[PDB]
Each structure stands twice: as C-alpha cells, then as structure tokens.
Amino acid sequence: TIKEMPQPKTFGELKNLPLLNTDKPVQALMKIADELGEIFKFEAPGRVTRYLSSQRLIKEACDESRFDKNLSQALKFVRDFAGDGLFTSWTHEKNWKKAHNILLPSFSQQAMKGYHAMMVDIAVQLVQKWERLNADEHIEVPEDMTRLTLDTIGLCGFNYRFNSFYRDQPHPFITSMVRALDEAMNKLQRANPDDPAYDENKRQFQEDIKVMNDLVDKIIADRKASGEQSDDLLTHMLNGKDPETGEPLDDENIRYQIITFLIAGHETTSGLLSFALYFLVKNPHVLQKAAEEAARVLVDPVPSYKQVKQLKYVGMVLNEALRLWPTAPAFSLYAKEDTVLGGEYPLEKGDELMVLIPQLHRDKTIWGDDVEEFRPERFENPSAIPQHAFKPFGNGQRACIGQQFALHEATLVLGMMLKHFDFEDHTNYELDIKETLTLKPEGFVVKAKSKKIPL
Ligand code: HEM
Numbered sequence: 001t002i003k004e005m006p007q008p009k010t011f012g013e014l015k016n017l018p019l020l021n022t023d024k025p026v027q028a029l030m031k032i033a034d035e036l037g038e039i040f041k042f043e044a045p046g047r048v049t050r051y052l053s054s055q056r057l058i059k060e061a062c063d064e065s066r067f068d069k070n071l072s073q074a075l076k077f078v079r080d081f082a083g084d085g086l087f088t089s090w091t092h093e094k095n096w097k098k099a100h101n102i103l104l105p106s107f108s109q110q111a112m113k114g115y116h117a118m119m120v121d122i123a124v125q126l127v128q129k130w131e132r133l134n135a136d137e138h139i140e141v142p143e144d145m146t147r148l149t150l151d152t153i154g155l156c157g158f159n160y161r162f163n164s165f166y167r168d169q170p171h172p173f174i175t176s177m178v179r180a181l182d183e184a185m186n187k188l189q190r191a192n193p194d195d196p197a198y199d200e201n202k203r204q205f206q207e208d209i210k211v212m213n214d215l216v217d218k219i220i221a222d223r224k225a226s227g228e229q230s231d232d233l234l235t236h237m238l239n240g241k242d243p244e245t246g247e248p249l250d251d252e253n254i255r256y257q258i259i260t261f262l263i264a265g266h267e268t269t270s271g272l273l274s275f276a277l278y279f280l281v282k283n284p285h286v287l288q289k290a291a292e293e294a295a296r297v298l299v300d301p302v303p304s305y306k307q308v309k310q311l312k313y314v315g316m317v318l319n320e321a322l323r324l325w326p327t328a329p330a331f332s333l334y335a336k337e338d339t340v341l342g343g344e345y346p347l348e349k350g351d352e353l354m355v356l357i358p359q360l361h362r363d364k365t366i367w368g369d370d371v372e373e374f375r376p377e378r379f380e381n382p383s384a385i386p387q388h389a390f391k392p393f394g395n396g397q398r399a400c401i402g403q404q405f406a407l408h409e410a411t412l413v414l415g416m417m418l419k420h421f422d423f424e425d426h427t428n429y430e431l432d433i434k435e436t437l438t439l440k441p442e443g444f445v446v447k448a449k450s451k452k453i454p455l
C-alpha cells in the first residue's frame, strides 16, 4: 500500500530549513526520527530529501542497482579543496574508478602489514606522552587521539611528520585544513552567501586552500625529484596504473587523494578512539575485560601485526563505539531509476535519500530493547546480523576505502593504552557531542595511572 511520508514541523516559506539551523543537526535529526519513525521528508526552498532510519528501508537503499552515492551539499562544499578525490567524486567520474582501482590494493588488510611499523611509531609517541605526565595532570582525550590519527596518516600516507606530539598549536597545514572544513560546514546554514559580509570568509577560504595545495604539491614534486621508493600511499600513487584504462593518476588528482586521506585520518578515526575510551571508562567491567585481553595478547615491548589481529574483544569494543556514535554519521544516495522503497514509498529517478547511521544503529528490531547499552558482546556472532544493519563505513563500492587502516590503527592504539595504563573518569564526565565534519565527545578528560610496563 502506497503511504504518505511523515514530515517534521515547518516554518512557512522556509519549510523545514530552520530545523538544521543548530550546532547539533545530527542529534536534532535523531530526535525527529524518534518522533516520526523510519522515514521522513525534509523540504527546503528548492530541495527535498528523505531521511531513513530503519534497517528495513536502508537494506533497499544499499541496493547499488537502484541507488548510487549522491554528493550531499556538505560533500560539494568539501569538494572545493578535496576536488575529485575518492570521497568527493561521483561514481561516474573517470577519476573515481581510476583512483579506486589503483588504491584498493594499498588499503587491503594485507597492506596493513606494511603500514604497521609506522603506526607503532606514532602509538609509542602517545604512550610515552602519557607515561611522562606528572601526578597532578590529566589527558585531553580527543586532542591526543587527533594528534595520533593525523600523524599516523601523514607518516603512512606520505612519509610526512606533522610532529603533533611536539606542538600545542596545530601544524599550519592543519590550521588551514580545519578552518577550510569549518567554513565548508558553516556554509550549510548560511543564508545569502554572496552578501559582501562574507568577502572575508571567501578570502580566508582561498588562502587556506592555497596553504593545503602548496604543501601537498611540494611533497609530490619533492618525491618525484628524489626517486625515493617508500612504504607509503604516495609511492603507490606515483607508480600505480589503473588496470582498466591503463592510466596512472595525474599529480593534481594525487594531491586531492592526499588531502582526502588527511581529512579522514584527522576526524572520524580520532572520534572512534575518543568514544571507545568514553564508553570503556563509563563501563568498568567492559574496560577490565578489554584490559585482560591486552595483557594476555601484547606480550612484547611493541605489538606485532599478528598480535593486533588477536585483539578480538578490543575490535568488538570499537564496533560497539561505531554502533552508538558512528563518526561519519550520514551519507546520501540518489535513485538511479523510478522505484518503490519498502513496497510503500514511490521514488522518481534522481530522488535523494539520507541514511541516518546513528538511528539505523538503534533499530530495536535488529539489536533488541537494550540499544542504548554499551555491550561489545553484541558483535560476538556477526553472521547473526541481518543485511545492512551496521553501516559505519558506508555502502558497496562507495564504502570507506580506509576501513582496514582505521580499524588497525584504532585496535593497535587502544590495545597499547589498555596494556600500559589504568584509567580514571576523574571529573565524572557528562557526554557533550560536538558536531563538525564529525562527532566527538567535547571536553572528555581522564587520568591515566601507569602500570609501569616498559616499551
Ligand atoms: C572510523 C574511521 C572512519 C569512518 C567511520 C569512515 C566512514 C566513511 C564513510 C561512512 C564513507 C562513505 C561516505 C559516503 O557514502 O558519502 C567513507 C568513505 C571514504 N573514507 Fe572513510 N571513514 C573512516 C576512516 C577513514 C580513513 C582512515 C581513510 C583514509 C586514510 C578514509 C578514507 C575514505 C575515502 C577515500 C572514502 C571514499 C571512498 C570512495 O568513495 O571511493 N576513511 N568513510
């Protein structure tokens, strides 16, 4: 039976647009989904989209014969500096399939054996930082996790050291990247963007793009000028040929790929580690089980690749953090042809869908009544999970190319943190989720008491 779609409250001629005039739009859309259910229409002047929250409908949205990746307005604003890199390109652009074919082997689970030593380099810098704190001191969790994830992708990506553990103020490239990302996100709720009042924003945005291009173009030119073969993605991109076209990536597209990886490794991955540690300190029995696994498995001064693979419970902790607060919380699709969603909702070719991942991950028909509880054991038997119920890394050929990298890095770092320190929630931290490009537990702080185990 063809059904009328619910719609949240309207503001006359502005329709639903003012609902996203908020500093926590994902959390606002989750509350709307709680009220309206598995699908709702969102209208603004000149656009309509449909927000999906149920596994029943998202399993159909994930059918690549019926739906392809759409560039949200968010991605279109980020494309002004990420260009036709993998994340901000349409599936039909030549540079998407070329870069996908060239880079897939560099991002495989087996490729992680080659990045492992570099990931350990940065993970040891984090452990040494925390070992060197004085008794009276605390840890700023998202800040240190971001130092770690940014430095890991810089070193594994391009053999470039941001040296984030040597700094209070970000590296100048990172101040320009963060300010460009903040401008991109700010433009989503900026009425009259061509008001001369925004001339200062536009000048600054162009300066920040120039800072990013200048450093990345220099690193690519320097690498071509040296002939050096390294264990990094830049070597793979300079040498690689697409088997289909037989072509390599050009230097401009390589720059966009590097900027794309640095955005990804600065945002989503540090939020995963921040939320994982938040949930562990709030659930001491889970923390104890994870710490027991780390002590049993990590028997050497630094972890081996194989030891990280044997941190099964730590991997379940990470999946359970991704379930509750996935740090890339939505993605957009368009209908390839006219189609009916869920036997109830007719769509025309081109019609857009948004997948609200945190709400999908709270579908009680999948996870049961205890959906708000942090219970990593939910992931003990993943064959029991119905199709498309768990989507923190997106869908199909447009799924996260970085998934294996992100999870290897996070499992290694969290394993070492649990081996080396006991943790205290010394402030009884009240979760406050700040929304930018990503989600983070803003102001999350802990104390770490060394177990005095040498590296
Ligand atoms: C916990 C960490 C991460 C999460 C939750 C995450 C999540 C996602 C999601 C949901 C998408 C699909 C976006 C869409 O459909 O519009 C995506 C795409 C992508 N991610 Fe990640 N990501 C993570 C880490 C990384 C890392 C570390 C890298 C690279 C080093 C990376 C690179 C990418 C790229 C290049 C794409 C585009 C892939 C394509 O369309 O060909 N991500 N990610």
Ligand SMILES: CC(C)c1ccc2c(c1)CC[C@H]1[C@](C)(C(=O)N[C@@H](Cc3c[nH]c4ccccc34)C(=O)O)CCC[C@]21C
Binding pocket: 020, 025, 026, 029, 047, 071, 072, 073, 074, 075, 078, 187, 188, 189, 328, 329, 330, 331, 354, 436, 437, 438
């Ligand atoms: C770049 C990646 C990492 C990213 C980051 C944040 C968001 C996305 C993706 C995609 C989804 C997006 C939200 C939830 C979203 O639905 N937006 C939609 C709808 C929309 C909101 N205001 C607009 C102004 C003009 C045109 C469209 C829009 C959209 O962006 O089209 C808005 C906040 C940022 C967020 C989480």
